Amino acid sequence: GHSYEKYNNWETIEAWTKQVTSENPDLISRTAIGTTFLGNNIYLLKVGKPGPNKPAIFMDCGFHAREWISHAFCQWFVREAVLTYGYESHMTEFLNKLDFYVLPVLNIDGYIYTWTKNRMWRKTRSTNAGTTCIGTDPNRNFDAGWCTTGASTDPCDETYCGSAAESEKETKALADFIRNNLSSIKAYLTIHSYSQMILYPYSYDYKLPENNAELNNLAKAAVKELATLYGTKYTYGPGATTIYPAAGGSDDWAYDQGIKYSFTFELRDKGRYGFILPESQIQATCEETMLAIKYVTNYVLGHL
Numbered sequence: 001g002h003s004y005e006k007y008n009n010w011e012t013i014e015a016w017t018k019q020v021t022s023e024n025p026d027l028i029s030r031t032a033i034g035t036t037f038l039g040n041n042i043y044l045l046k047v048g049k050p051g052p053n054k055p056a057i058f059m060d061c062g063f064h065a066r067e068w069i070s071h072a073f074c075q076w077f078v079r080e081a082v083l084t085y086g087y088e089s090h091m092t093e094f095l096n097k098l099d100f101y102v103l104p105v106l107n108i109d110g111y112i113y114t115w116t117k118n119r120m121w122r123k124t125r126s127t128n129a130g131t132t133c134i135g136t137d138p139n140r141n142f143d144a145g146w147c148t149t150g151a152s153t154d155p156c157d158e159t160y161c162g163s164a165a166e167s168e169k170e171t172k173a174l175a176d177f178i179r180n181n182l183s184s185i186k187a188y189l190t191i192h193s194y195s196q197m198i199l200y201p202y203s204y205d206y207k208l209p210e211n212n213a214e215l216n217n218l219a220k221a222a223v224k225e226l227a228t229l230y231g232t233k234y235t236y237g238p239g240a241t242t243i244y245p246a247a248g249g250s251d252d253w254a255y256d257q258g259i260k261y262s263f264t265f266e267l268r269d270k271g272r273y274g275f276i277l278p279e280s281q282i283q284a285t286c287e288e289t290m291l292a293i294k295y296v297t298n299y300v301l302g303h304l
């Protein structure tokens with residue numbers, strides 16, 4: 001069975017996407033936006049009070065297989081949306097005015113692999129010509145300074161950038177969806193762990209984005225808000241200087257598509273448990289992250 005306070009395997013998350021939609025058709029629609037290399041269904045949940053010509057925020061989780069708290073957050077977010085709509089004024093306004101496109105797990109094949117074989121797997125599970133080595137790093141696979149820095153051209157490496165930008169079915173599916181909905185998508189949020197950071201462009205170069213001041217102020221306010229709940233301290237800034245250079249990232253790509261609010265979240269912790277964050281921290285991690293996500297949503301909505 002599914003639990004919001006445990007890590008759930010893909011079979012369970014999939015059944016959950018169907019169940020939560022079936023139980024809340026007036027707040028959620030489910031579509032598949034493509035298949036993974038191994039033929040799993042890439043679900044996208046449109047969360048919001050349905051209506052004509054609404055703006056949108058796009059959020060994905062599960063780019064990287066071992067970052068289990070990421071997957072857990074997208075599920076937590078959806079329950080908060082459906083349970084508090086109509087009761088909590090902010091979420092009610094959010095869902096009335098805009099849609100959240102929530103992609104609960106992008107790299108499903110890798111996620112399944114962390115359950116069945118190797119808990120520390122990161123990449124996709126696609127084959128590579130000429131080698132037995134498996135997988136591409138999805139967050140090096142976007143057309144954003146592709147493979148120019150902080151990425152490897154070797155399929156056997158953890159940061160393999162792929163045979164070409166969008167070579168992976170999963171990243172092509174995500175990019176295709178965003179390109180087809182650029183007019184409506186006002187913010188792009190991509191959830192990773194760990195490090196307790198909010199990052200914004202750029203990661204493929206040390207150059208700063210045109211609205212750097214605004215993004216910094218927004219990130220600063222969001223981390224302050226997150227800390228109000230349990231005292232958890234986040235840092236923030238441009239990807240390249242705040243953590244390390246990493247070309248081909250989805251946040252940089254989305255930004256260069258014209259989505260002016262583009263953020264990578266790095267959730268708990270700072271290395272004590274790393275990727276193996278105990279289930280006993282899921283609730284607190286998700287609740288504080290909610291505050292930051294809602295702060296950003298409120299800001300974006302107020303600036304349309």
Ligand SMILES: CC(C)[C@H](NC(=O)OCc1ccccc1)P(=O)(O)O[C@H](C(=O)O)c1cccc(CN)c1
Nearest residue numbers: 139158192193194195203239243244246249251264
């Ligand atoms: C502990 C976190 C920082 C994660 N990093 C990570 O697992 O690094 C593994 C690694 C292994 C070998 C070489 C280089 C890196 P992740 O969430 O994967 O960091 C991402 C990424 O590497 O895709 C990240 C790092 C820097 C900037 C961005 C935003 N574009 C995103």
Ligand SMILES: [Zn+2]
Nearest residue numbers: 064067192193
């Ligand atoms: Zn990651």
